[PDB]
């Protein structure tokens, strides 16, 4: 989604933080460690 | 002085300005999570911004 890489960086730091939120809530799951996933931020937002 | 307490990996620097001179800060943070693979053999390739 026309991606900055500004916003390439903030988007893997979410990712992490989501990585570890799922082990410390229910670690029984393992959805986000062990697959892949494509996601879409539809473009518009100005880059600031 | 925009920071106080400087978090890490901010440090200030004097800079010889067009005009007078100012006192810039520079920064540096991780663009990806660290241990992709505890193995990985691979540079840690910077990115100059």
């Known amino acids: ?48 | 002085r925009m920071y106080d307490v400087t978090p890490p990996g901010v440090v200030m620097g004097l800079a010889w300005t067009a005009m007078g001179g100012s006192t810039l800060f520079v920064e540096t943070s991780l663009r990806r999570p660290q241990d992709k693979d505890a193995k990985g053999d691979k540079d840690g390739s910077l990115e100059v911004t």
Do not use: C, W
């Open chain 1, 1 to 48: 989604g026309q991606l900055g890489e500004v916003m390439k960086e903030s988007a893997r730091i979410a990712y992490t933080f989501a990585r570890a939120f799922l082990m410390q809530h229910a670690p029984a799951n393992d959805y986000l460690v062990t697959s892949h996933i494509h996601l879409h931020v539809p473009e518009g937002a100005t880059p600031k």
